[PDB]
Write a protein that binds this ligand. Structure first.
Ligand SMILES: *[C@H](C)[C@H]1/C(=C/c2[nH]c(/C=C3N=C(/C=C4\NC(=O)C(CC)=C4C)C(C)=C\3CCC(=O)O)c(CCC(=O)O)c2C)NC(=O)[C@@H]1C
Ligand SMILES: *[C@H](C)[C@H]1/C(=C/c2[nH]c(/C=C3N=C(/C=C4\NC(=O)C(CC)=C4C)C(C)=C\3CCC(=O)O)c(CCC(=O)O)c2C)NC(=O)[C@@H]1C
Ligand SMILES: *[C@H](C)[C@H]1/C(=C/c2[nH]c(/C=C3N=C(/C=C4\NC(=O)C(CC)=C4C)C(C)=C\3CCC(=O)O)c(CCC(=O)O)c2C)NC(=O)[C@@H]1C
Ligand SMILES: *[C@H](C)[C@H]1/C(=C/c2[nH]c(/C=C3N=C(/C=C4\NC(=O)C(CC)=C4C)C(C)=C\3CCC(=O)O)c(CCC(=O)O)c2C)NC(=O)[C@@H]1C
Ligand SMILES: *[C@H](C)[C@H]1/C(=C/c2[nH]c(/C=C3N=C(/C=C4\NC(=O)C(CC)=C4C)C(C)=C\3CCC(=O)O)c(CCC(=O)O)c2C)NC(=O)[C@@H]1C
Ligand SMILES: *[C@H](C)[C@H]1/C(=C/c2[nH]c(/C=C3N=C(/C=C4\NC(=O)C(CC)=C4C)C(C)=C\3CCC(=O)O)c(CCC(=O)O)c2C)NC(=O)[C@@H]1C
Ligand SMILES: *[C@H](C)[C@H]1/C(=C/c2[nH]c(/C=C3N=C(/C=C4\NC(=O)C(CC)=C4C)C(C)=C\3CCC(=O)O)c(CCC(=O)O)c2C)NC(=O)[C@@H]1C
Ligand SMILES: CCC1=C(C)/C(=C/C2=NC(=C\c3[nH]c(/C=C4\NC(=O)[C@H](C)[C@H]4CC)c(C)c3CCC(=O)O)/C(CCC(=O)O)=C2C)NC1=O
Ligand SMILES: CCC1=C(C)/C(=C/C2=NC(=C\c3[nH]c(/C=C4\NC(=O)[C@H](C)[C@H]4CC)c(C)c3CCC(=O)O)/C(CCC(=O)O)=C2C)NC1=O
Lengths: 169, 174, 669, 161, 158, 160, 161
């Protein structure tokens, strides 16, 4: 996996344009938000359990059939698996927020995720909904902490959804 | 410590520390005076923080082993909280959470299951301690110390509060 | 971004334990028939089944009373049983015959703990009350399930960690209710002392396991910086099947040591092949293990370096596949990432197979999992937290058919994870025929399997290499293509015919038999045998008399029973679709749009409608019109590369010196 | 494809000899079972759409597969699953009439796994659907003919894994 | 990079990034602008660096394939020198030797042994380039740049 | 791996209802047949080698597949065929004791077709061998026990 | 193929929900940028031939690629390279208009590496040519629209590498 700086530096040699003006501008823009990325990751790590618990409770509110008999969140075994996987998603999204690059998600979260979920019958719609709920809760916590320009926080979660959701149109 | 972690990572891969790791070590060395000042501040405010947090905790959760009328249990609970504050000070000095993990986090749930202390009570106590630490320290000192208390809380926060499948009423006790 | 897929093996994880399942699983994992003790256990369980059924029926018939006894012990100020929702039967499902025709109207017509505080039903809320009542009924139902199953696992796996999921405010209350239910249940036998013992045991197990306070997740720490760390809840491990683990002790009797040695053979060689292949040297190794000179680790290391292991799992395989198999044989797991494969490939390149065996056995992971005395065992789903990245490859590696697959399964997937969609059919590499003159040659799924599925969506369009063939007037728009083996301007064209007999010698570009043979050779790929043209003779006549065009002649050729038997009768449906499209349109299909359209036509109407749809397409009219026999217009990348096997023209390799007095130092004495 | 008679003929032909008495006995068994096979084929033809409807209701409806984001979500994917089930039923009837599973291997199973993996179709769900279809057919036709058709349904299910 | 190393270390233990690791990452993100300025200085002066260093290297190491009368060898050597100067600049941008190691240190000995180019000559050339670069950098910037030259030299020594 | 009890418990649990009398009746039939099922499991465990010997003698010996060029030629392939027959018998006994076919679907048919097609093992001869084994087991363990073993023998044969 | 609106609709549809305020804000951003996107499409269409001419002149001409033995030698291969650059420019314009890179994933990058390796087309020279084309387009349409088009040019280049 790579972070933003590593990918940009390697692309500098790959593309043959070296350290031109556009690369310098993108590097400066990225470095301007680095402290905010670290702060966002700190907030996510300090409130991980609360975020996951809130998101899973809201998911079971919006999908009451999940916890009913025959549902996928039926029994504490599957409930614990739900919580565990949502923690996985939150952890790797925090990693991607720090790195500024989505390669960590590609290599350690999304590679083979669809195969696993098809094998185990894990529904993807509720998975995307839970990721979006976690994203909303993280945004609420960041607004509470006083952060202002936190658009990049949307990038991992949304991206993950786009990678796991099926094609409808 | 951070130096120990860098050395272990380098030795696992059989190589000298890279220039970036050396620069991180140099930054950590430069931050040492501030780290020591923070550790001293935390050490000097231990007793008062513990006392105020115990008061708040007993106000919040009365049905606890530390509030069962046993002086030994009360002393043990206050001692445990002081120990966790001491471990946080060790983490401040060491530059990472490894002292906390290696002394009071790995096996903590097993220890409290064996001793008999409910972990939600421990979590509420630690939330009270975190509130006291935030109240006493300056905003910068709190911003530097509170993350370790949040790290402690994250270990014993699941499963548990919050609960959302309810009407929000808390007076159902009868 | 991640379009590569390792496949989705069909997995059925265990959700709880039953006595027959546990006994049979233990026997299965040791590769032998049931023991006398295990058969006795099964017989004892079966002989007692009627009593268990009677107990479960007794508990079921009084379920409302037991749940009411539990609820009345903790709830005040209301009727808790009003919030107990029974399961509802799904009546009138489609196809059930509940409604006849399209007419739907006529179908109708123990002391409490110190300081215990009760729960006010009204202030607790409808949501929480429904939660509580369904929880009590669920507890009773799972207790009856555990009674029938002969094992309390279905309880233990589902209540350990439940404390806190059920709010910590009411855990005490829960216990109270459970005890109340227990009391009521024990009131329903009072005459057996054995059924009461069983019910007491199950209720006590439920209470004891529910009292565990936040059990720790089992952490799987990454073995290197290229591997992720994971967590597995204890419930998943408890519900999963149990690995029988063998620990070698020098103080054990000879039979137990031999059993552990047989386990080692079953793991390293996937089977005890030692007797079959005449592994006589085994004896010496076994002595060195029995006398305690070496450990299980050194025994496994010597087995990996033996000639038997080389013959079984090195000689038939390439280096990549051999590494992938050795991962399972010496670590009980598949490779995790391509960096791990790279390190093991470098180890094998430097030192060979013994070096690879040393790298596996001497790893910190081996000592972490098996140490020195534990026989290596298969890890995987249910034993520890699994990674998604090697899900399919590892599940396929743990199957007994792993040594039958020769194409690597891990390095290929790990490489394709980093790449865009492959150059292949959207339905997989098995849907791409060989681009030869004739014959539908496809990769068989079950013979030398190497499928590499990718997530092609419905809008992907394939990139095809134009052959540059066609008449000069039908060119200059795609004239930049060039493919070896293409007859460029040699297309078969027959201008339509428009009271006296013709001259004896009238010459076209191709004689009538030559043109007909060319049409047959294009539609069928090759000339038919002697009598096989008999059914189409009349059609040929209609082509020679101008009754039908070349397009109609081609359509009739493709609709004949010979074509159907050659390319439709014994072909997978979409494979037949793709091959017929390549033969008639002259190109492979672009993507799932055309493939789905033709598959729907084949599903609804059949083969003749598919031929009509291909021939009547506007692209067919644009490319071949009415008078031209089809021809190859596009090839795939692999088909292009198969026709270009010579590269000596590009290996031309890569004067006056630019320096006076080269390779000399300044101011030399 | 290849039916029971062709299978016995080919077994004799690879050895270059006439049908031995055991093959003749097997051929007589097939000839005697032909009447039951024809009756079962008639019954399945009459109620094919009803069989598929009952299969979908029994194994797929009101699960997470048909919920939004599921694989049977949207009308086109629902119709595609129904089309695949129709194919399975028709070819199971063909194989039952023929007395051989050769047509199933040739036409249905040779490439279905990789196709489903590429499309993201849950193979476990479709195996459960095929088993539910076997149950529906055995309820419609009977026990003996239901078991005979279930042979080929089980072959389809095994080939899907 | 150090960000990637910290993320991998946290991932191995199945834990979020600890406050100390976050502090380290924040410090390097703060220093990123200074590292970018240093790398820009390296890039803008790469032609003079390569010119002076190559002249010095052919003075001190004359018996080398580039200094043998072959125009192609000399051009390839100069291209390689410019390549390594640019790689050091990019790895200065990143702040750790990881990009330079991944592109031109792992397998460099094998690549130049297959090419039949002495690795000691490469060490001499990198030494000359390092000296020329240090001539035009402040001591503070040299503290950032020199260790990558040293890493390359160590990776090139047989 | 799944037995009859697991299947019935799961079918009741999906709809969230207790064991209805039909499921209780199926469980009772399984439990009552357990005695003879264990008895015939003991008999098969005692006579597995003889069963395989008789099966090979009456279905594979003195045919083309034993002569050179056949798939049972050479001692290694003969031993492999005998081992496959032992596998089929043992896993049929497993499936009988479990009262379910899940073990066969999980550890026999999962990869059987791929293995046999990659190695060139003839499917038809294997089917005939499994049929002969079913006949031998039926003649050894009696009519009803033989029939309930032949259910799983036929499941294996239809899987191929 | 999906554009910005279709991507947002898909993400909302798998959850079975109407567009949330965040996706509605993204949609409003796309609508606001639509005018600039149309202007950039017009500008690139008007200068497509000149853009490709300058790209070839500054990245491929007078190198060993156009010399005999190079992959741009002979008129057919030169014309094919120019055609490929036209493809890249046109599809980058399509992706910029759509505000989404899915068109490049489904129609440009799928199997492109295998096809180029089969034909012997130099991948690195193609990446450098795409970089030169991005620079030319940025100089032509300005810094902001240039960066927006460069997003998709970089997507193509990263897919090729
Ligand atoms: C004869 C020397 C040996 C032999 C041959 C044999 N071949 C087939 C069938 C096919 N042969 C081909 C080969 C080609 N395809 C092409 O495009 C070309 C170039 C023009 C060639 C040479 C193909 C594709 C087939 C498939 C069937 C078809 O005719 O389309 C058979 C029949 C096998 C069958 O099972 O049908 C045979 C027997 N076999 C021997 O034993 C000889 C040594
Ligand atoms: C209401 C206007 C009419 C009608 C409705 C009705 N629907 C069902 C069940 C289902 N409806 C759907 C619909 C869809 N699935 C999709 O993917 C889409 C595209 C977004 C649609 C519209 C499905 C899949 C089902 C099956 C059940 C399920 O959701 O899994 C029923 C059947 C109820 C039953 O079980 O009997 C009915 C009756 N009924 C009317 O009278 C109206 C004309
Ligand atoms: C229904 C039981 C399950 C289901 C099915 C499903 N299938 C498709 C699409 C396709 N399925 C096939 C399969 C076949 N190809 C063959 O040759 C044969 C034998 C005749 C079969 C059975 C094919 C070719 C397609 C076409 C894909 C396309 O759209 O081009 C879908 C739609 C998938 C999509 O992405 O649109 C579905 C849903 N899915 C389930 O969940 C059921 C359990
Ligand atoms: C003679 C020295 C001993 C003897 C032998 C004996 N053999 C059979 C039958 C078979 N023999 C074989 C042998 C082989 N198959 C192979 O692939 C190889 C390797 C090249 C060998 C050696 C086989 C397969 C059979 C089975 C029948 C067949 O050939 O189709 C018999 C008859 C067994 C029966 O019960 O019918 C006998 C008697 N017996 C002795 O006592 C001698 C010591
Ligand atoms: C005997 C009835 C027929 C026969 C069989 C035959 N099989 C092989 C090889 C293998 N058979 C298997 C099968 C399994 N292994 C398992 O663990 C299980 C599940 C319990 C099964 C079903 C495997 C894995 C192999 C490959 C490994 C091995 O060789 O042992 C052979 C040898 C094939 C070869 O050429 O190597 C044979 C001959 N062949 C016949 O002709 C009989 C009809
Ligand atoms: C001269 C009669 C006319 C003319 C020519 C002209 N050409 C160029 C540059 C190039 N010419 C080619 C030609 C070919 N490439 C091939 O592969 C073949 C077939 C074998 C041919 C004929 C190429 C590739 C170039 C590009 C430069 C290079 O060397 O790579 C120029 C220069 C244009 C420029 O500098 O941009 C000119 C002037 N000009 C006239 O006025 C005559 C009518
Ligand atoms: C130019 C920048 C470089 C170059 C290119 C080059 N390409 C070809 C031939 C082909 N290019 C393609 C590419 C595509 N076709 C599509 O439909 C799409 C998607 C819209 C793409 C990307 C294909 C398929 C071919 C094959 C031939 C054809 O046109 O059908 C060539 C000629 C190769 C040959 O000799 O056949 C060349 C030279 N080469 C360079 O050196 C430049 C760096
Ligand atoms: C072994 C069978 C089994 C049971 C019973 C079980 C219980 C269970 N109870 C839950 C919730 C809950 N359960 C209760 C209440 C109570 N529960 C009790 O057993 C008390 C009698 C009562 C309090 C007096 C409440 C209030 C919730 C919702 C908690 C929340 O707000 O999230 C949940 C979380 C899912 C959800 O919120 O729908 C589970 C899994 N899990 C299992 O696998
Ligand atoms: C870091 C990348 C990664 C992921 C994502 C992952 C997922 C994952 N989830 C699993 C289980 C599971 N996951 C879920 C549920 C869900 N899961 C969700 O992400 C949803 C929120 C929810 C459904 C909406 C359930 C129910 C199971 C247990 C399946 C069973 O019943 O066997 C399993 C099988 C058990 C195990 O070995 O852990 C894996 C591998 N593993 C990985 O390495």
């Amino acid at each position: 996996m790579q972070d933003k700086l590593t990918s940009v530096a390697k692309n500098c040699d790959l593309t043959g344009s070296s350290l031109n003006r556009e690369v310098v501008e993108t590097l400066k823009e990225f470095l301007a938000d680095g402290e905010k990325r670290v702060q966002v990751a700190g907030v996510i790590g300090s409130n991980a359990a609360e975020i996951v618990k809130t998101a899973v409770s809201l998911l079971f509110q919006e999908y009451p059939e999940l916890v009913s008999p025959g549902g996928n969140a039926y029994t504490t075994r599957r409930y614990n698996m739900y919580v565990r996987d949502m923690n996985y998603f939150l952890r790797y999204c925090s990693y991607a927020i720090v790195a500024g690059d989505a390669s960590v998600l590609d290599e350690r979260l999304l590679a083979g995720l669809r195969d696993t979920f098809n094998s185990l019958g894990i529904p993807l719609g509720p998975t995307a909904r839970s990721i979006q709920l976690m994203k909303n809760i993280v945004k609420e916590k960041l607004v509470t902490a006083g952060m202002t320009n936190i658009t990049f926080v949307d990038e991992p979660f949304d991206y993950v959804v786009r990678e796991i959701s099926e094609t409808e149109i | 410590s951070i130096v120990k972690q860098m050395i272990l990572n380098a030795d696992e891969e059989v190589r000298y520390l890279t220039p970036g790791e050396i620069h991180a070590l140099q930054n950590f060395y430069r931050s040492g005076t501030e780290r020591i000042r923070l550790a001293k501040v935390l050490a000097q405010n231990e007793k008062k923080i513990v006392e105020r947090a115990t008061q708040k905790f007993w106000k919040i959760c009365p049905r606890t082993p530390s509030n069962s009328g046993n002086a030994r249990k009360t002393e043990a609970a206050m001692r445990d909280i002081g120990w966790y504050i001491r471990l946080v000070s060790y983490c401040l000095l060491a530059g990472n959470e490894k002292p906390l993990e290696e002394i009071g986090l790995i096996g903590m749930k097993e220890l409290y299951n064996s001793v008999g202390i409910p972990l939600e009570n421990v979590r509420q106590y630690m939330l009270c301690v975190k509130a006291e630490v935030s109240a006493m320290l300056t905003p910068e000192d709190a911003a530097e110390v509170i993350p370790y208390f949040d790290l402690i809380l994250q270990v014993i926060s699941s499963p548990g509060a919050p609960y959302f499948q309810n009407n929000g009423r808390t007076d159902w006790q009868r | 971004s991640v379009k590569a897929s390792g496949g989705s093996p069909v997995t059925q994880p265990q959700r709880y334990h039953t006595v027959p399942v546990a006994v049979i699983s233990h026997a299965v994992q040791q590769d032998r028939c049931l023991k006398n003790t295990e058969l006795q256990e099964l017989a004892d369980f079966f002989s007692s089944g009627v009593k268990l059924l009677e107990i479960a029926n007794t508990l079921t018939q009084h379920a409302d009373e037991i749940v009411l006894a539990g609820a009345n012990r903790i709830f005040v100020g209301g009727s808790p049983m009003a919030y107990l929702e029974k399961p509802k039967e799904k009546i009138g499902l489609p196809g059930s015959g509940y409604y006849v025709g399209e007419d739907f109207l006529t179908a109708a017509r123990d002391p409490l703990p110190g300081g215990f505080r009760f729960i006010n039903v009204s202030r607790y809320g409808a949501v929480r009350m429904k939660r509580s009542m369904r929880d009590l009924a669920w507890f009773l139902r799972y207790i009856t399930y555990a009674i029938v199953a002969g094992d309390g696992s279905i309880l233990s796996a589902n209540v350990r960690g439940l404390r806190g999921v059920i709010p910590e405010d009411v855990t005490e209350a829960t216990i109270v209710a459970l005890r109340a239910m227990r009391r009521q249940s024990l009131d329903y036998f009072l005459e057996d002392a054995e059924a009461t013992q069983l019910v007491k045991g199950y209720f006590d197990l439920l209470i004891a396991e529910y009292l565990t306070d936040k059990p720790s997740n089992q952490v799987r720490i990454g073995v290197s910086n290229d591997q992720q760390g994971l967590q597995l809840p204890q419930s998943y491990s408890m519900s999963a099947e149990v690995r029988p683990k063998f620990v070698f002790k020098q103080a054990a009797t000879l039979t137990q040591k031999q059993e552990a040695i047989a386990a080692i053979y079953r793991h390293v060689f996937e089977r005890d092949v030692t007797d079959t292949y005449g592994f006589t040297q085994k004896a010496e190794l076994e002595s060195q293990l029995i006398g305690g000179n070496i450990s299980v680790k050194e025994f496994v290391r010597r087995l990996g370096k033996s000639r038997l292991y080389r013959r079984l799992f090195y000689e038939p395989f390439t280096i990549s596949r051999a590494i992938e198999l050795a991962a399972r044989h010496f670590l009980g797991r598949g490779l995790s990432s391509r960096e791990e494969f790279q390190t093991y490939f470098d180890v094998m390149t430097k030192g060979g197979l013994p070096a690879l065996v040393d790298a596996f056995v001497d790893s910190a992971e081996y000592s972490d999992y098996f140490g020195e005395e534990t026989v290596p065992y298969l890890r995987g789903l249910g034993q520890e937290a699994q990674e998604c990245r090697n899900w399919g490859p590892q599940l396929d590696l743990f199957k007994y058919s792993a040594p039958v697959r020769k194409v690597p399964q891990f390095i290929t997937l790990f490489g394709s994870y980093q790449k865009p969609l492959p150059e292949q059919h959207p339905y997989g590499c098995g849907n791409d025929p060989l681009e030869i003159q004739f014959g539908a040659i496809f990769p068989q799924e079950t013979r030398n399997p190497h499928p590499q599925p990718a997530f092609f969506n419905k809008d992907t369009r394939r990139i095809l290499i134009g052959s540059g063939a066609g008449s000069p007037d039908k060119l200059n728009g795609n004239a930049l293509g060039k493919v070896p083996g293409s007859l460029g301007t040699r297309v078969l064209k027959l201008e339509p015919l428009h009271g006296h007999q013709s001259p004896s010698v009238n010459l076209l570009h191709h004689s009538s038999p030559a043109f007909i043979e060319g049409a047959y050779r294009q539609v069928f790929g090759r000339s038919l045998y002697e009598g096989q043209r008999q059914p189409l003779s009349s059609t040929e006549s209609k082509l020679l008399g101008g009754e039908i065009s070349v397009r109609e002649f081609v359509r009739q050729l493709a609709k004949s029973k010979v074509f159907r038997s050659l390319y439709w009768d014994s072909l997978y449906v979409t494979k037949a679709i793709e091959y017929i499209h390549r033969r008639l349109m002259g190109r492979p299909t672009y993507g799932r749009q055309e493939m789905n359209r033709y598959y729907d036509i084949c599903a609804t109407r059949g083969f003749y409608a598919l031929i009509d749809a291909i021939i009547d397409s506007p692209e067919y009219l644009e490319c071949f019109g009415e008078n031209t026999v089809p021809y190859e217009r596009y090839v795939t990348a692999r088909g292009y590369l198969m026709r270009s096997p010579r590269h000596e023209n590009q290996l031309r390799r890569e004067t006056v010196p630019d320096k006076y007095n080269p390779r000399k130092a300044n101011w030399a004495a | 494809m290849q039916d029971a008679i062709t299978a016995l003929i080919n077994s004799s032909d690879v050895q270059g000899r006439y049908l031995d008495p055991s093959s003749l006995d097997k051929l007589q068994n097939y000839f005697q079972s032909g009447d039951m096979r024809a009756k079962t084929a008639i019954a399945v033809s009459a109620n094919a759409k009803n069989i598929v409807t009952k299969t979908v209701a029994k194994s797929l409806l009101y699960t997470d597969i048909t919920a939004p984001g599921g694989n049977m979500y949207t009308c086109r994917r629902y119709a595609a699953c129904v089309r695949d089930l129709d194919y399975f039923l028709r070819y199971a009837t063909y194989a039952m009439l023929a007395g051989d599973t050769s047509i199933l291997d040739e036409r249905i199973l040779n490439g279905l796994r990789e196709t489903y993996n590429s499309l993201g179709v849950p193979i476990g769900a479709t195996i459960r659907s095929v088993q539910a279809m076997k149950e529906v057919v055995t309820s419609l036709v009977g026990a003996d003919a239901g078991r005979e058709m279930g042979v080929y349904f089980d072959h389809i299910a095994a080939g899907l894994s | 990079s150090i960000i990637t190393k910290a993320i991998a270390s946290a991932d191995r233990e199945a834990r979020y990034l600890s406050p100390g690791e976050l502090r380290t990452i924040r410090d390097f993100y703060n220093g990123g602008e200074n590292r970018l300025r240093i790398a820009t200085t390296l890039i803008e002066n790469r032609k003079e660096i390569v010119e002076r260093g190559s002249l010095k290297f052919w003075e001190c190491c004359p018996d080398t394939p580039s200094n043998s009368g072959n125009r192609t060898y000399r051009a390839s050597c100069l291209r390689d020198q410019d390549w390594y100067i640019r790689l050091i600049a990019y790895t200065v941008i990143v702040g750790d030797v990881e990009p330079l190691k991944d592109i031109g240190i792992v397998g460099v000995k094998e690549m130049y042994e297959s090419l039949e180019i002495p690795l000691r000559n490469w060490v001499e050339c990198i030494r000359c380039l390092k000296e020329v670069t240090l001539d035009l950098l402040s001591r503070e910037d040299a503290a950032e740049v020199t260790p990558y030259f040293d890493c390359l030299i160590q990776g090139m020594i047989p």
